[PDB]
């Protein structure tokens, strides 16, 4: 009868809470009034479209302003000594010298420097003028409108799909593997061959003439002939200059390895062959599940067949087909887990093997990106583990999964939790113990007494990969190894050359300071997983509260009685888990930032010597590289690092409000409000105004979220200001 339209219960709430929950309840379909599986799936589908339309519009927006407000064309001509423009600024709040200050580049007013690496992205892909950016902006905007269209389209009763269709998993897998993965990477490879490669060779190929231009001299003869080697006949020379004819070859598909020496990025020929190769594996593999032809696998049959003899895995995977196909949260958990891993995967491979020409020369961009994807990966992981327990509560069928791997999982969960506890306490005690030991020796002027363990195991791996520093002589280090002799005339010359250039990021040199920090990160991993896993497995029931599953995923507590039950819900478990996310990726991003900062600065001996103790982090990382940042203004004058320092403090202030909502809880605030609501009602003149919605204190769960949110935002923004301002 009032908004929340989707909840009678919340709509009848007389207070301001109705509002808050209404905002908070909006996307939870299963909890709305008179909901069905059909409406659930259909709303989810439409929502996916909605997301896509926002994404395409967002991307088009970037291209739009780079083309309209940027210096894209000044960059292409001189990428090394021009700062890429993101956007113009029109701020009526700025003072006279502010407008002078922010006018960087070739700009006719105040501008901001892009640290997204979209320049080098574009530029490496083939984008040459503002025109190209405009056309792409129009296109993707058109795709946005199309997606919006499509959302409302399959909302009508004629175009409403049936639940059976949504449950056709085999078909979606076949199509996504073959088409979405296979075809689209094949088509990209098409783009690299037809546009990117020629663009790097200095021949501008556009919509109007591609069809008329030969990418290879004897094109499409090798292809059908099976003389594929001709496509790798003459690669670009070692003196090739990117985007110019000088030193350019004709090959379209190679396995060279290493980098394009002047740009220091992967070879677009290697990238072409890569996308093409995977494309084939995807296309062949995408014909694996049974649909409407009779040929193909059964998922159910595969899963149910995989039960080992002598019941060492119980009933194996029997019943998982149904509990997965039914459970949406399960699918989102698997998806988020995989997506989180690959997000960090991307982050860790991109920095050490950059793919873009004249990236990695851009320090700030690289730092910004690598922080970006690791934090995104962290949040995504916590979320994976957050729809973990939502499954465990709402979705699991105890009878239908009897004695399976899943039920057996629940069975020995105390073992799992307790052994994670062991693994985290071990690390926590020893690593901290060895650091603080290292500090005390530093303090007393005896650094020779430090406990510095050399990372022999990683140093071994680097040796097996062909770095020769450590002199183990294994695999790709040793010249008398089959592994060496096999591919020595393939790509190893490009590889080995790149691994041993220590001015690049590829498999950096490692010492005892590396050793400690990785075990700090391991502490990060294991503990966060302890919170999340514990929260997932005890979502259903515990000894304190056996009937927890009757309440659901978020609840304040179960009262003060029998000891006290604050932060008992799996919700709260995930909440607690976010703090470790934050702390852990905080450590990882620092690790990253410094070990590069000292590389770029030209003194890696700063890192190796101060990373072995924590004051070293405090003094040589934090205290040193904020010098310029905090100076952005002083009583004497100003410079260009105004916004970062403003935002630095902004983040800190957000960070401390969070503490407010986290530490102080409801009873104080409500009674505060209780006196205020009397105060209003017997204040004359003001008497004549009264509220419609009774003023009430935010909930516990509300307080829980609002703290967390402020904390995270402050975290991110503060670092971002630091990272960028210092690296720049």
């Amino acid at each position: 009868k009032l908004f929340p339209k989707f909840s009678q219960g919340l709509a009848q709430d007389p207070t301001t809470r109705r509002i808050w929950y209404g905002l908070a309840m909006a996307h939870d379909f299963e909890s709305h009034d008179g909901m069905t599986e059909e409406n659930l799936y259909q709303k989810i589908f439409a929502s996916h479209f909605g997301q896509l339309s926002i994404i395409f519009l967002w991307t088009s927006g970037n291209l739009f302003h780079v083309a309209w407000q940027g210096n894209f064309e000044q960059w292409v001509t001189d990428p090394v000594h021009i700062r890429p423009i993101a956007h113009a600024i029109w701020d009526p709040h700025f003072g006279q010298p502010a407008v002078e200050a922010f006018t960087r580049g070739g700009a006719s007013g105040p501008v901001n420097i892009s640290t997204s690496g979209v320049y080098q992205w574009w530029y490496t892909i083939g984008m040459r003028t503002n025109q190209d950016l405009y056309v792409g902006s129009v296109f993707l905007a058109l795709v946005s409108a199309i997606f919006l269209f499509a959302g409302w389209l399959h909302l009508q009763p004629n175009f409403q799909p049936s639940l059976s269709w949504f449950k056709d998993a085999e078909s979606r897998l076949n199509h996504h593997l073959s088409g979405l993965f296979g075809v689209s990477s094949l088509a990209w490879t098409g783009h690299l061959v037809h546009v990117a490669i020629p663009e790097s060779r200095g021949q501008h190929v556009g919509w109007d003439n591609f069809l008329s231009v030969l990418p290879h001299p004897q094109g499409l003869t090798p292809f059908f002939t099976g003389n594929w080697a001709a496509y790798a006949q003459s690669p670009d020379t070692a003196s090739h200059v990117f985007g110019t004819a000088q030193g350019s070859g004709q090959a379209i598909l190679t396995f060279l390895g290493g980098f394009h020496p002047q740009t220091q990025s992967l070879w677009l020929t290697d990238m072409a062959h890569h996308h093409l190769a995977i494309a084939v594996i995807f296309i062949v593999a995408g014909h694996m599940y049974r649909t409407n032809f009779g040929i193909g696998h059964r998922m159910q049959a595969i899963l149910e067949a995989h039960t080992p003899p002598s019941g060492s895995l119980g009933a194996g995977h029997k019943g998982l087909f149904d509990t997965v196909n039914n459970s949406l949260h399960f699918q989102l958990g698997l998806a988020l887990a995989s997506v989180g891993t690959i997000t960090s995967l991307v982050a860790q491979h991109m920095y050490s093997l950059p793919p873009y020409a004249f990236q990695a020369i851009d320090f700030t961009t690289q730092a910004a990106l690598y922080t970006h994807h690791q934090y995104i990966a962290g949040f995504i992981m916590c979320g994976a583990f957050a729809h973990g327990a939502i499954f465990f509560i709402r979705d699991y069928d105890p009878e239908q999964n009897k004695g399976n791997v899943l039920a057996r999982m629940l069975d020995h969960k105390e073992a799992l939790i307790s052994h994670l506890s062991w693994v985290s306490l071990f690390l926590g005690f020893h690593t901290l113990g060895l650091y603080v030991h290292n500090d005390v020796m530093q303090a007393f002027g005896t650094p020779e007494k430090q406990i510095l363990i050399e990372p022999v195991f990683a140093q071994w791996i680097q040796a097996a990969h062909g770095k020769a520093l450590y002199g183990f002589d294994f695999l790709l280090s040793s010249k008398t190894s089959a592994a060496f002799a096999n591919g020595q005339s393939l790509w190893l010359p490009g590889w080995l050359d790149a691994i041993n250039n220590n001015q690049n990021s590829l498999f950096l040199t490692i010492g005892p300071g590396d050793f400690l920090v990785h075990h700090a990160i391991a502490l990060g991993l294991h503990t966060t997983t302890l919170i999340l896993v514990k929260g997932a497995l005890d979502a259903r029931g515990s000894k304190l509260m056996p009937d927890k599953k009757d309440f659901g995923y978020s609840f304040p507590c179960d009262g003060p009685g029998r000891g006290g039950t604050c932060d008992i819900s799996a919700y709260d478990a995930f909440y607690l888990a976010v703090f470790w996310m934050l702390n852990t990726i905080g450590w990882v991003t620092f690790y990253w930032h410094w070990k590069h900062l000292t590389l770029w600065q030209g003194n890696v001996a700063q890192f190796d010597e101060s990373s072995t103790y924590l004051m070293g982090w405090l003094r040589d990382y934090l205290w040193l590289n904020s010098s310029q940042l905090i100076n952005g203004y002083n009583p004497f004058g100003m410079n260009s690092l105004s916004v970062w320092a403003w935002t630095f403090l902004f983040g800190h202030l957000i960070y401390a409000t969070g503490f407010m909502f986290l530490i102080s809880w409801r009873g104080y605030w409500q009674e505060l409000i209780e006196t205020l609501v009397w105060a209003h009602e017997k204040t004359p003149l003001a008497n004549l105004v009264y509220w419609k919605d009774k003023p009430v204190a935010l909930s516990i769960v509300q307080a829980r979220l609002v703290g967390l949110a402020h904390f995270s935002v402050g975290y991110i923004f503060t670092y971002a200001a630091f990272l960028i301002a210092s690296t720049s």
Partner: protein
């Protein structure tokens, strides 16, 4: 040598870390007479600090480009760095743990056990203390016998 790092017995930086620390204390010792109290301390520290460096050079640890001794943690040039100590711990920790096990179980059957966690039966504990010397031989035999697990 191992991971290409130099031995402390030879390395230059390590031998220049000797010099700096010693030549910090000899810039202090000037400001005092030779008969005085603190001069006997700034001489004794030096003697100890100069002895300390000598005793890693004789130990033969690997010192890096840093000048600091790094450690080796797997196999046999540098056993004593970790591989021997490691057992030291697992023993004395296993000692403590198994004594604590034999105490709690030895109390368990005595009407109210909780009193013995607070007003600890010292002459029980000090007998279990010595018994806990031969613990791995008991710990193994108990894993065999099958009284170790619930």
């Amino acid at each position: 040598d191992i991971a290409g790092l130099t031995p402390c017995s030879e390395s230059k930086a390590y031998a220049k870390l000797e010099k700096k620390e010693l030549k910090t204390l000899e810039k202090r010792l000037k400001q005092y007479e030779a008969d005085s109290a603190p001069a006997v301390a700034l001489k004794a520290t030096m003697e100890r600090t100069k002895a300390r460096f000598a005793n890693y050079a004789k130990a033969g640890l690997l010192c890096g480009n840093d000048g600091l001794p790094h450690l080796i943690a797997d196999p046999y040039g540098h056993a004593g760095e970790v591989f021997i100590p490691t057992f030291g711990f697992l023993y004395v920790a296993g000692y403590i743990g198994y004594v604590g096990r034999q105490y709690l179980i030895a109390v368990k059957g005595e009407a109210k056990p909780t009193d013995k966690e607070i007003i600890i039966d010292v002459p029980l504990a000090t007998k279990l203390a010595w018994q806990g010397a031969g613990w791995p031989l008991a710990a193994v035999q108990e894993l065999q016998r099958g009284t170790l697990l619930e």
